[PDB]
């Protein structure tokens, strides 16, 4: 249960998102879970009336198994009145990192673990431990 290193996850942006509000098209943020963990998700922030956001916004996991461990994406809308709606989620299994390296994924968005619902693209970057 010790942490093996720390990966940085940049949510960089989203391509063609779906409209989904009756004006303005969306309101995208994206909620990003590690699996096998307690921390509450982390989210972006919420970008008005795009549906290609750019975020570059970075976050912090600490990292376990890189073997077993997997990241889930969830894109949502947001509403000032109502619970988020669910847009599209993929996931990303650390098993993917590479040591000191920025690697780049495209995940398209999908319903469930079908209509296009775009893409989002993503960097990690895994720092281990030493000694
Ligand atoms: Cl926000
Ligand atoms: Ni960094
Ligand atoms: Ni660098």
């Given at each position: 249960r010790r942490p093996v290193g720390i990966v940085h996850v940049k949510v960089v942006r989203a391509v063609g998102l779906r409209k989904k509000?009756?004006?303005?098209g969306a309101d995208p943020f994206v909620k990003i879970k590690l699996s096998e963990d307690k921390i509450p998700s982390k989210k972006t922030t919420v970008k008005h009336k795009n549906l290609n956001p750019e975020w570059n916004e970075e976050f912090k996991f600490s990292v376990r198994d890189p073997q077993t461990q997997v990241l889930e994406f969830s894109v949502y809308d947001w509403e000032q009145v109502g619970n988020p709606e669910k847009m599209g989620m993929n996931v990303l299994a650390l098993k993917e990192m590479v040591p000191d390296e920025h690697k780049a994924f495209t995940l398209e968005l999908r319903k469930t673990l079908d209509k296009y619902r775009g893409k989002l693209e993503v960097e990690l970057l895994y720092k281990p431990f030493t000694e």
């Open positions: 509000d009756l004006m303005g």
